[PDB]
Amino acid sequence: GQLIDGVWHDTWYDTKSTGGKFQRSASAFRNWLTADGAPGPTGTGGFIAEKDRYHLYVSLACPWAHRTLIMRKLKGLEPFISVSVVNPLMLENGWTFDDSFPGATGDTLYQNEFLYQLYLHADPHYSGRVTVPVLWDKKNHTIVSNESAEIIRMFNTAFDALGAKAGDYYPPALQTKIDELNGWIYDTVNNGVYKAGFATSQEAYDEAVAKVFESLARLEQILGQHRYLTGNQLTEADIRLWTTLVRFDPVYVTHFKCDKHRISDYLNLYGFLRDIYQMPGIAETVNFDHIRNHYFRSHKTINPTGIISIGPWQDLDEPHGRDVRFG
Amino acid sequence: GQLIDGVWHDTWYDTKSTGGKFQRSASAFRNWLTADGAPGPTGTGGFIAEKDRYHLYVSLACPWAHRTLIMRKLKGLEPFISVSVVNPLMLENGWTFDDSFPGATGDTLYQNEFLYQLYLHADPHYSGRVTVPVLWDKKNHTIVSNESAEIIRMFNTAFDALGAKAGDYYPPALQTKIDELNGWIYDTVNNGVYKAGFATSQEAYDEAVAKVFESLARLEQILGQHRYLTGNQLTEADIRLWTTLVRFDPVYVTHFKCDKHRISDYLNLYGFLRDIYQMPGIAETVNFDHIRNHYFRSHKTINPTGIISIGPWQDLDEPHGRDVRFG
Ligand SMILES: CC1=C(SC[C@H](NC(=O)CC[C@H](N)C(=O)O)C(=O)NCC(=O)O)C(=O)c2ccccc2C1=O
Ligand SMILES: CC1=C(SC[C@H](NC(=O)CC[C@H](N)C(=O)O)C(=O)NCC(=O)O)C(=O)c2ccccc2C1=O
Secondary structure (H helix, E strand, O other), X not given: OEEEOOEEEOOOOOOOOOOOOOOOOOOOOEOOOEOOOOOOOOOOOOOEOOOOOEEEXXXXXXXXXXXXXXHHHHOOOOOOEEEEEOEOOOOOXXXXXXXXXXXXXXXXXXXXXXXXXXXXXXXXXXXXXXXXXXXXXXXXXXXXXXXXXXXXXXXXXXXXXXXXXXXXXXXXXXXXXXXXXXXXXXXXXXXXXXXXXXXXXXXHHHHHHHHHHHHHHHHHHHOOOOOOOOOOOOOHHHHHHHHHHHHHHHHXXXXXXXXXXXXXXXHHHHHHHHHHHHOOOOHHHOOHHHHHHXXXXXXXXXXXXXXXXXXXXXXXXXXXOHHHHOO | OOEEOOEEOOOOOOOOOOOOOOOOOOOOOEOOOXXXXXXXXXXXXXXXXXXXXXXXXXXXXXXXXXXXXXXXXHOOOHHHEEEEEOEOOOOOOOOEOOOOOOOOOOOOOOOOOEHHHHHHHOOOOOOEOXXXXXXXXXXXXXXXXXXXXXXXHHHHHOOOOOOOOOOOOOOHHHXXXXXXXXXXXXXXXXXXXXXXXXXXXXXXXXXXXXXXHHHHHHHHHHHHXXXXXXXXXXXXXXXXXXXXXXXXXXXXXXXXXXXXXOHHHOHHHHHHHHHHHOOOOOHHHOOHHHHHHHHHXXXXXXXXXXXXXXXXXXXXXXXXXXXXXXX
């Protein structure tokens, strides 16, 4: 599933990467949207924050797109950023504006039917992956960003003066601590579960899966000491941990065979999971149907049957007391 | 894949229709070992219980085979019954005498290569599945029985005058309850994990896995009232349930997608599991290396990578108190 020099290549990708790692737009969509329209640290201006200009294209299944939705909720960005939700099933073409599936909405702007359409509608000679989430500029018809880690930093502050809800999920004091955390939590866990669930060899799988539980144990301990990863405050590290956690019992445990312990077995990790979940307007950003149809039904490499498991038992509404406990 | 009128048939079993519920060989081997050599209810006579004559061919991974090993220990039949353990791994020619794998012993009698050869040595023109366990008559060079449910009833009485340990696992007073439990357990549970695992449609899976957890729940009430399924007496219905229980967290949970609850989440089922496991002599009949290699690696249909999940944590040695709670 890549788009090469403007044409879709289903999965006929391909017959030897002949020089190689592609290419000049392996991320040419890394602009920032800004309070004043100035350029961010990469990319170009003038993406100034304002209402009725911006649009988020996402899956409800993807942990990477899910952080942008969480952020849009916590920051009160609903009146600023309207949303389209691709179909959960990622087959031959890639993400799909296939409606039908409850909560998949079609490309509700320019009703394409492929996410690679939209990426071309903004570079028709584009060479690279066709990913969610996509931060889209209704005005200049292109892609501000398709990088979830940055889109969430835009949301963190770019709208503050236009009346976003209060909250700074990357405050200077903690940016160091947050950055170290984002780092290992990405290797060992955000990525850890995909590495394990897509292992080729058994020694690869043991490798990944062992790392996954070595980090679960280490995080169980930190959470642990204080309500969240860095202490008493919610930060973007927590939200990024969280998008993986909420998927772990319903999917990564049986489907990616990370099956040594369920999250609901750790006191603190499970407490954390329920804590963030119960924050207001966070539950509605969680769709288990898209989560489970997507992973079970799309990864025929791994689950030839497309049979979706009954799924580990869990009640995320169970009061957690992490607000009392801490600190 | 089957044996067809004498020849080993890898997969293609065989000419689809044109014959024939498989087959004049379904007629199975269903003789009885009896104390006096009279025939049982099926087959012929002349299988008199006696030392040095009879042999058991098992897999250590299968729960049908496991039954006959448990019954062999509880009844103290080791002096009369020697054992060969196929190899865990069901390649293209079903069960195999490959002894590379620890605990896999090769054909301790006839050093054939393949279990199906044993069936051929007892029958040039055999046509049926080639299963474990096999109860082998060294003297006549044929198969007494390849039916685990009957084999254990023969172990339960046939050697009673030759020094078998006292013990009836199917006493006349409990038979009608045992026959009901057996029926319900084999359908929804010993077999239920298989119907769910190898379902083909979401729907057939949904129905199978539902019935599993619904039976587990009822078994959990039952085992909350007394040590064993029918009271304080251990019976063949317990043994039959237990050999599926013991495989459940290591394999069926993840490999057959019977997730939702692990056995170790049930107070009573999990106590019951540890209770039987810890009986003098039982623990040695359990081999997780075989159990887990067999299911993960042999079922390429269902687990293509043939990777063996790290597996749900459990510790069966921990004290259970069911000797005393009751009852
Ligand atoms: C993530 C992930 C997927 S599905 C979700 C995915 N998310 C990302 O994009 C991560 C970075 C991102 N740009 C940002 O930080 O926002 C996407 O939307 N699609 C992929 C595609 O179509 O290329 C997969 O299916 C797979 C399969 C095999 C190995 C690894 C993988 C693998 O690692
Ligand atoms: C049972 C069972 C198996 S497990 C291994 C099987 N054992 C028996 O069934 C016992 C024979 C007798 N009835 C008993 O009471 O002992 C045998 O050794 N081999 C099967 C073969 O090689 O054909 C399986 O693997 C499978 C797979 C797919 C669908 C159903 C099934 C399915 O139903």
